[PDB]
Amino acid sequence: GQRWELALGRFWDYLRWVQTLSEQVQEELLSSQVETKLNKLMQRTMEELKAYKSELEEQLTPVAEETRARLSKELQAAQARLGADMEDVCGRLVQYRGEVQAMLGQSTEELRVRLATHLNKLRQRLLEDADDLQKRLAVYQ
């Protein structure tokens, strides 16, 4: 398991707890603690990923520059897909905080159900985009 995969694993571990939407989660969500921690976990994932990309590129047996730039761009695509998935996670959690803050004490049940439905979809993308990224990195080296 590469460093970036472990970093993504810590992102997953925290996201999974957040999705329970317990009252403890709601506490740390409305205090912006959740969006702060998820942002850091996301950044460390992308940083490790960037550095790990540079690693494989240097150990790559030389090839025609055209293929070199294509595989590079193919990996930036998968790299960008993962990044967008995580950013979207943080976003919907920020949005939820803003909505509750504007709800003046009414029931957040329906908001939490819609949030869970959206996190489940974003979650599905991260599995897919992360898997494709792992495959494209392996064939790389």
Find, among 135, 130, 122, the residue nearest to 46 by Cα.
130
In order of their start, the domains of the chain are 1-141 (1.20.120.20)
3-state secondary structure labels for all residues of 56-80? HHHCCCCCCHHHHHHHHHHHHHHHH
Phi-psi region of 22 (alpha: psi -120 to 50; beta: other; left: phi over 0): beta
Nearest-angstrom CA–CA distance, 135 and 110:
38
Encoding tokens for residue 108? 């957040």
Find, among 10, 26, 19, the residue nearest to 118 by Cα.
19
Residue 114, number of CB atoms within 10 A of its CB: 13
Residues contacting residue 125 through CB under 8 Å, at least 6 positions apart:
81, 85, 88
Encoding tokens for residue 74? 């193919």
Resolution in A for the shown PDB structure? 2.0
Residues contacting residue 12 through CB under 8 Å, at least 6 positions apart:
126
Task: Please compute, for residue 104, the number of CA atoms within 13 A of its CA located in the half-sphere on the CB side.
Answer: 0
